[PDB]
Amino acid sequence: MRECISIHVGQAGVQIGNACWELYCLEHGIQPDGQMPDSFNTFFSETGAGKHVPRAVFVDLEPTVIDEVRTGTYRQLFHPEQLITGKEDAANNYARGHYTIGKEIIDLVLDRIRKLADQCTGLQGFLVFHSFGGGTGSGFTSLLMERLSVDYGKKSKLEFSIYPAPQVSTAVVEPYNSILTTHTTLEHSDCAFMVDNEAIYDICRRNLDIERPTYTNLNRLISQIVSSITASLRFDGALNVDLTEFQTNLVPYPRIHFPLATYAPVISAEKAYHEQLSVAEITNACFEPANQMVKCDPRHGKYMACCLLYRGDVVPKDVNAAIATIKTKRSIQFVDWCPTGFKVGINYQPPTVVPGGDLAKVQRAVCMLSNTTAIAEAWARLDHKFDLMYAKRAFVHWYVGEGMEEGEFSEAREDMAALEKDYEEVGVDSVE
């Protein structure tokens, strides 16, 4: 009875959830009606009849993408008081997400979370799935992370964000929305995992040999990471891990809680043969700089801590041989103050295959959750884009007129520059 509810905010939050909750139903044989022909009691609640509902709260400010769920195939699965919508979207605006529109339905969502918190007793933590780009995914999330630390506090809050790509940027005001939502979540979130879009396009083009992927094919690869993190709660393993245990082993200082996720093996079905895929093979595919799912070269920085989450037919002795060769290599380097930099987790259940997909049925798979200082180069260029646009005071007249102090930008930039030198404090070595 280790229960855990998950919150999906924004359009990027919902379309990940339609591929996550597609995956959880297939692992336990759950029909789209909620019926089925125990261990899965964490992410469900069996009612008086034989029907199971998800412990999820979808929320969005625009009614477009929620009506995909209310009319699509997974229609009878969700409780209709969970699917909270709004009249108008925040529309690429942190101020509408946090001051104007987000203040009108924040009392309704907290009422729905508290009705899902009372029927559980082993509630470990939350799972907020949002994006730094849009207005709802950033503004309404930064409002939501404030209201959870006031009410609950002790529960470990995790986030699977969508970090903006260095080159591919859909919205123009993504440097504005990323800084203002990271100034706010820095005090409240405990571990915010980073997943970038452009690095998944680099994997689907090279490894899977798909020339034209859509957002559906990206949401399949994201939900495999979401499954392998919460795989130890839903099944029995030889060496389990819990959501309280991620924030202890990967967040050394309270200001540095931005890891990056990496999944392996990602290969096609015609390439699923011709190679045996042992754990000594697929572990080095995680630390390879071409298979990381954030566009950041890991050889520029140092690994502070790493978390390998094995699953499948995995031998515990061969894991010990696989990690030991990584610490003998020369391109992979750790920080000087951390001699013991691994969190190891083995689960028995092999990863399942969604039909109509592109990955093949394998026998084992590795999810790596590594916290490196190579992300410090990525925060520098995001602060470089923010300083260029704000020097001309571009796009400020939208944010001032929607109820925001004009000097709050200058308070956000000085706090982010303080985060910038904190990686410089870590990266240096010690005397004697």
Added chain:
Amino acid sequence: MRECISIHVGQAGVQIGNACWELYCLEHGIQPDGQMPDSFNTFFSETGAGKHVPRAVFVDLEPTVIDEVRTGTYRQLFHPEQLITGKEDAANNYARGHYTIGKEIIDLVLDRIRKLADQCTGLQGFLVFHSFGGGTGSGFTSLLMERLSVDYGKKSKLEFSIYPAPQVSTAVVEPYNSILTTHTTLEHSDCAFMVDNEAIYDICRRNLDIERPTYTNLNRLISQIVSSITASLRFDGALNVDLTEFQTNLVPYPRIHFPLATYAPVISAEKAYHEQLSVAEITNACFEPANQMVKCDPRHGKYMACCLLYRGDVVPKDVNAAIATIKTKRSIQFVDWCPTGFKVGINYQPPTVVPGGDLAKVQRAVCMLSNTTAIAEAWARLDHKFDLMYAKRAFVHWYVGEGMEEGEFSEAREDMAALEKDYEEVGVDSVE
């Protein structure tokens, strides 16, 4: 567990490999799908299923001849990440092979070799199959032999080159490409075997009685030599030999490592009768100057060392009688400082017969690997052709404009002339 990977470079490399890997599959019953209805673990790697893949890396700069493999009969056998191609060919140009085009995919091939080096532990050495004529077979090989001595170093690197014929020359700039690729491989290769095209036409016309052979029929006779060298690794023999043992017994000085291969018996099926083919008969067919596969008269020079590789139903006593008569003849002469000039190897397995071929099912066969100074006449005429074309500065404007120092020809010719007098140092006798 004595494993060995093989590298096929250029169009002449690949079309030998399509007749080599045809032959290795038939010796062990391997289907073209890789399935089969142990000892063969050297040149294969059995996966989790019942499928075997070759330990080969085909590489070429043009996508023409690689698409024969990706569409032909042996399609499901090779791992599709091994078949490394390129956009445009080097097109009879050492500079495009080593400076312009070869520098763009040399990082991709070394990544694929290192992924085949890590899953082996008894890795003896390499097998580079290239040609001195073309741009990719010479330029990309000379780049590749530099990158292997930096990374690996201790492993015995063998080469099965295609030496250009004295009269039949397809490309015009073969004297340019042969010198520039021998100036580079002289420091890195350990033993580079020589096989000439024109001498195989002389054998197929006279012995086999085929008036019109194609390149397919030449690649059958080459792959019989490739099989008989690596026959001692793949089976049990009465007196084995390894790939580390070829470089010790045939390379006396570090500048002289150009032997020549000779195979016997090469007879037709209708002539497979009428003669008994004992080991005292077929051994003298190797030292006969009409059956050597390099157009060089061996009576002009002296044999420095020889390596006989018997296979089949071979009696060890009758080998001793067969070698002893050769040292009593007068046309065959050895160098004065080498009284013991034989390396003997007996294997039990008879040579198999590929269907649709021209050679017959025999009971025994001999592969001779002899290192003579009769090749020193062949290096003289190749330096004579190089001095004629370079005196008029013909074809130099292609090589200068593709990123090459103009004086590098004058550095290549002075180094090759130093190789020329090294055979003169060997051929003289001693005082007292």
Added chain:
Amino acid sequence: MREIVHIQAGQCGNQIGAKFWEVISDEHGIDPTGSYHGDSDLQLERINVYYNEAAGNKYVPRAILVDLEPGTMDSVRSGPFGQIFRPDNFVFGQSGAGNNWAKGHYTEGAELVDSVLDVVRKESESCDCLQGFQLTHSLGGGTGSGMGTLLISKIREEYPDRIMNTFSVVPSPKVSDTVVEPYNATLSVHQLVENTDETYCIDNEALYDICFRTLKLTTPTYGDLNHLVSATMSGVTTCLRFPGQLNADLRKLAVNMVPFPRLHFFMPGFAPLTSRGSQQYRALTVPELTQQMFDAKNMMAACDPRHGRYLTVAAVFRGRMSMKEVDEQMLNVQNKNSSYFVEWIPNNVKTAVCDIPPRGLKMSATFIGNSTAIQELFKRISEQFTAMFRRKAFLHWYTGEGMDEMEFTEAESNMNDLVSEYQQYQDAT
């Protein structure tokens, strides 16, 4: 008479104990139901040492199972021999450890230890004459470290004269399961040096080698590794559960192995260990037991005994053997290896001989050795502890639960007061 209360803690202490009671039940002939299906009558002579007779010829173990999350207890009751434990003994909390020592010994330790000791005190007042406790935990995690050392501090206040031994799993040198495992080990050794009487240091890395170098196993799961530890836990009290020629117990091996009250960290060893297809070529006789104990590829701790000195050595033999051939082999290894022992203790080999082998073998031994080669074990933890503490990294998860630097500083200073003793007596004369 002379009963033993078994206490388990953490994820690892359950999965050792769930294999440990599978070995004890196969020595006494107990089905997974709980009845008796034995053949001889020596198996029920001393059945009270671990089993309490229930109503209707059923025997239930005297086990107390502790965890901070119900996940591991969900697999123990559902597995084999999980229907033999009494359901009142499953004491679990709903919060969760979090893999942290502060949540194990301070915050969620105090909310549970008052409910565990209602079960410990009930089992202790049911026994006739209590011998001593035992504990199975791991120093890496949070429940086996924090909650595990909290129970020992409460027991030793109530029961001072009773012995208290722990089967710890000391973290490996090369790989590391927990990132903050130097903090969870340094704050645990500070509790064990003042509260236990003897402690068995076991490394995971030394067990992966024996399954790979000696037993030759292709896929050793934790069912294969924890079967070797459970054979050694039964091999210490095997002179108590069965009659013998020279009998020992948990007190004779506590007196003769502990010369100073701080030096009580051991290393265990088991013999014989044969491969699968090589158990017919090997002459399984009495001097084969001796040569397989003392070599360094058979210790269960990742430390070479050649670097140190053996202070005291206990050998617990099983099966019908002769006493001269024991004293022949134990003396000859003390003459040819005359420098690797210590000088100021004459004749430092303890002998104990039982009569009944384990199920399957003809005879067997058990090595309980003390050494100064475990100073390499604490010079590696204290090096990793001061490498992390000088940056004050991973410290706000500990300081935020009511903890100061004096808790850390007096812990690391106590460990360097332990290293300076093993380095002292290694060079004394």
Added chain:
Amino acid sequence: MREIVHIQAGQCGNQIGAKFWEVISDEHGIDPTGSYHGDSDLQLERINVYYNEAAGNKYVPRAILVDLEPGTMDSVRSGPFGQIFRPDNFVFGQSGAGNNWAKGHYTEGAELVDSVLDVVRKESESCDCLQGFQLTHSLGGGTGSGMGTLLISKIREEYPDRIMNTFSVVPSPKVSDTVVEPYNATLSVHQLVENTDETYCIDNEALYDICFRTLKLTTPTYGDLNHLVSATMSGVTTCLRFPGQLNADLRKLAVNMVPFPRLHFFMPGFAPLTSRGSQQYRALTVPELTQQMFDAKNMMAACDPRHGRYLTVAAVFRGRMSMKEVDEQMLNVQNKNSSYFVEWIPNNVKTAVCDIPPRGLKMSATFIGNSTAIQELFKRISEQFTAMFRRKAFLHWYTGEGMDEMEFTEAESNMNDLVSEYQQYQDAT
């Protein structure tokens, strides 16, 4: 009592030993499984000299098998009598020899010899009273030369008083298997003159003749050649494994055959040897054994004994025979061949008589002869060595592994210090 540890090395030393243990097992009646299926009771009286009794009436050989590549060990364990060796004794490396002495004695020799001597020392401490070792190798290759002479230099430091004899395969005069075999022989004889006690020089060319001139074989494979060597290796210790009238061992044949501590290179001979269809026309009596030993077509070294002088001669007879008829034949060959022996040693024929013949024959002998006719053996190697070294050919494969010319020069000078002794005592008076 008086046990012998057998050491094998190289490709050739395995394929002699794999035939050698097939002959010993047929004299003691051992199946390929490892049990006993004998008929008499004299076969188990001295079974401890080569076999250790395992558990369950199985006997495993006291053999130690060494190679630098796993190819030859793959065929020994899979062939007949390959399931009798203990699998721990198969000590093999993954690198490979390369047919080079520098990779045998310097580079890959040192990475393996520390793991071989853990097996040598374990077998030597298991024997009651050790007699002496024996080694089977070849001077041509790299493993039998480099790794083979490295083991002798490490053993003679640990065990000085124990005897150490090698069954070498000296390379043939006419044909040559290895191109660089003068380098691999000259750098091996320099090690054998200061580390062994007696050495049996065997040439391949002398074995191809006997299968062609005496036994009349159409297709002699190496199973036919190595069966003659294995009959001579058993014929030396046959007075130790069975009782006799005048008993000898590996020490009596070491004292009475070695007059000077550098002169210990022998030549072996075996009798009787009959053809297939001519073993009925021949009178197989006692003087037929004598006339078949001393003639030059029966020596196992490619050198004519008429050119030199016999210093010492050992004849080891087997089977129930009479002692007068031995002393009749051994004296008459010393009177008519009075010039071919030496003058300053009177009565230089050693006699040893066993009681049990080999399986199949009625009686047999074994000739262990020393001579100065093996100065032709070293004047042919030192001629081929100085013919290659004066051009410095094939030298960068040796110099590139940490080796100088002083290693070569002191090796060739030691050999010419050995030729100048056999030429000295051939003409002394």
